[PDB]
Amino acid sequence: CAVHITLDPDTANPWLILSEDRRQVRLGDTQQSIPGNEERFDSYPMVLGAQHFHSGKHYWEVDVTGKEAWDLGVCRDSVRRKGHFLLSSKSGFWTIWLWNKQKYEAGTYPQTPLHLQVPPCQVGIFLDYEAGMVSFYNITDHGSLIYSFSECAFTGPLRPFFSPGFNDGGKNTAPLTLCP
Numbered sequence: 001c002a003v004h005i006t007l008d009p010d011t012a013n014p015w016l017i018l019s020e021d022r023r024q025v026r027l028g029d030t031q032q033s034i035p036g037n038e039e040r041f042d043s044y045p046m047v048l049g050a051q052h053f054h055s056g057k058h059y060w061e062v063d064v065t066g067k068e069a070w071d072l073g074v075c076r077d078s079v080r081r082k083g084h085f086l087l088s089s090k091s092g093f094w095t096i097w098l099w100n101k102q103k104y105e106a107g108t109y110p111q112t113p114l115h116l117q118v119p120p121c122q123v124g125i126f127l128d129y130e131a132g133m134v135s136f137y138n139i140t141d142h143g144s145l146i147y148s149f150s151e152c153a154f155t156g157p158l159r160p161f162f163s164p165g166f167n168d169g170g171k172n173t174a175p176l177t178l179c180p
């Protein structure tokens, strides 16, 4: 069920730099000047996969090597794009995140701390639509389960969700890379 993900530049916050092949994204030093369109996330450095999931099983892996912060998973296509919101399962985002170098958490509401013995350099994301399951795997630790969201009971199409961090004038400029 391994799927070739590509990043949708129409969704990408101006703080983001996408590679030419749209297989990579990183935080930029400054905001790019880019057309204001309704699909674009305007308040946080977030971008979606081009791919839409209506059903079935879907798997992809991401390199997070050298990063102090990131967020990965899946969201409803219907999520609001403009203004401020909370990354939570209750808001249509099924994600895990790193921040402050070592704080791993699942984006439940309220959030669930994760205790990772081996810090992941690559993360696997498995979506099972009919099961209502989004699962996260520690590829560095031989595929151990990081976290699973269960009985999410999805209605509409879902999208891959990425953020290579938030802008804090910090050093978190290494890219997220989609693994071949």
Ligand SMILES: CCn1ncc(C(=O)N(C)[C@H]2C[C@@H](c3cccc(C(F)(F)F)c3)C2)c1-c1ccccc1
Residues within 6 Å of the ligand: 044, 045, 046, 069, 070, 071, 085, 086, 087, 088, 097, 098, 099, 163, 164, 165, 166, 167
């Ligand atoms: C979307 C708002 N939001 N929802 C929940 C949380 C939250 O509690 N904080 C602790 C963690 C930081 C994690 C993170 C890691 C990498 C990239 C991003 C982002 F937002 F850019 F996509 C976010 C999410 C926040 C948040 C709070 C402060 C600053 C920015 C966001």
